[model samples]
Target chain A: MNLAVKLTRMEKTLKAYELYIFSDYENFENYVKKEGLKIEGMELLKEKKARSLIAEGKDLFETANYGEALVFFEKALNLSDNEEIKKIASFYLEECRKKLAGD
Target chain B: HMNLAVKLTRMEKTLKAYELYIFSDYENFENYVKKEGLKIEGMELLKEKKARSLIAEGKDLFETANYGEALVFFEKALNLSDNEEIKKIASFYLEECRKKLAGD
Candidate 1:
């Protein structure tokens, strides 16, 4: 019974997350427009997409797929408007370059 | 090849400029909040615990590629924390979650 309840809660949380992302994007768009800010690159998309690219890039980087990971990180770096996200991407981009150079 | 290198260099410079901008905003943010008398304290321990749990769950969801869900947790974590460090960490993760959801 406890497991069932937990599972149900989890499902609900997941659904809520989806809804929040959609609405948040709308809010972000509105804010940017109101501020007269033009978000290009990764900043234009929802955070999930940029995070996915970075995560995938990290995975590739871990597997010594420097070239491919570089592509993903570069995309993340180019598109991100957030400093933290950009910092993460820049760190990974630096590592990718080092690895590629070493090879 | 040379063009790509130059472009990358320019991008890095732009990122540095943005970093500076954000840094300045952060420095001003606390002062602004204080001046505005925004409530920055009074978080209960229970709320902190809840926020920590949310962060953990959000990270798990993130690893599973459920970015939208992860974002929800992170945002909750950000709202629940009273500690500055916790709030910053949550906000950082929340920002990532937003990027992932919006990425192409």
Candidate 2:
């Protein structure tokens, strides 16, 4: 299907962001404190955090610390928007998960 | 003034080169294109500066869970061209944002 059609569906799916944007950061922060940092909030801060998460995940993955690597990859996967980064992180994340499961 | 024929010629060549590079690595894709007796006739689509920028900026917004802003950039990138891989990548992240927003 065309990008327009797909995006229209996606826009409907992500309608919650409209609400979050209007709320105060305190409310958002409090909600996150209770629920975890899964929801989209502060834009700039999240970007910086995701960059670090991917970097750290790559480092741990390279050192063969599959357990530690899995943690970072999971974080990166949640935070990253770059599909290439996400794909790489996912592949490594699965590898680490398999390794840890075996152990 | 811009020449329409020249522009069309360049655009055609650019798309061909872009397709070859998208599915495979740079070096390998280039060689494969050459081995097939194909010639790159333009550098327009190969540049991909705009799409790449959108992805980089979108990734930054995405890291903080800013699905709203990320969706904007991803949509821009997806519409920037008909590069299948780039469109696919943008679509993938766009869906991920959709899921996150849906609380799923």
Candidate 3:
């Protein structure tokens, strides 16, 4: 009885970590698929969208659009689970904070 | 094609200048392999663990909020006298804090 439930729970946790890492990963969705994790239910599409948002955020950040960058980062974070993806996000977030902190 | 080499050299010099003028942190360099999306998975975990404990002790800092700090303590965990790596993480986190507080 609990076996199915346990499997489901494990899947959920793994999905979360996968999502988190998938958000702004270097290769992103490709890495997700490479990991042999399931990609059904249009999950790959979700990751693709997240990747696009992060790219958009990158452009905004480069242009010093701190406000917009945060929005995109937030969007990406929503799609992510809890991977080390925060490193890159924090890089930009911290940059935005610096720009706004002074002016 | 004759000017290509000179132009490339100039570009290199410019990049170096940019590094000197703006590069405040070397933690990325020290941990470049890890940052390169490397496969050595556990390399960061131990440092992550150390930074986690440090953050726990402070109980009021976001030091655990980053890998750079983990890099810092990781170096310390390996050896406190490693000021070079410590400085690298310190500079990065300093920039991180300045950015974080700048918005507040």
Cα displacement (angstroms), candidate 2, residue A7, comes to 46
lDDT of 3 by residue, B1-104 (tens): 64545444444343332232122233442354333333322335434433333323222243445544444443343342233443344445445645655656
TM-score of chain B of 2: 0.53
TM-score-better candidate, 1 vs 3: 1
Model 2 per-residue lDDT tens digits across residues B1-104: 33544444444444444434433345564565566555553333433434655666676678788999998988887887576766777798888878877864
lDDT-better candidate, 2 vs 3: 2
Clash count per candidate:
21, 2, 4
Model 3, CA-based lDDT:
0.47
TM-score of chain A by itself in each prediction: 0.55, 0.50, 0.51
Which residue runs of candidate 1 sit more than 4 Å off their true CA positions?
Answer: A1-45, B1-104
Candidate 2 Cα errors over 4 Å, as ranges: A1-103, B1-43
lDDT against the true structure, per candidate, is 0.60, 0.58, 0.47
- Measured against the true two-chain complex, the DockQ scores of the candidates, in the order shown, are 0.01, 0.02, 0.01
Ranking by lDDT: 1, 2, 3
TM-score of model 3's chain A: 0.51
- lDDT per residue as tens, model 2, A1-103: 3444444333432232222322333443465555444433345444444554565565455435678778778876776777877887788789998888894
The best-first sequence of candidates by DockQ reads: 2, 1, 3
Expressed between 0 and 1, the share of native interface contacts present in candidate 2 is: 0.00
Interface RMSD of each: 22.6, 13.6, 23.1
For model 2, what is the alpha-carbon lDDT of residue B68?
91
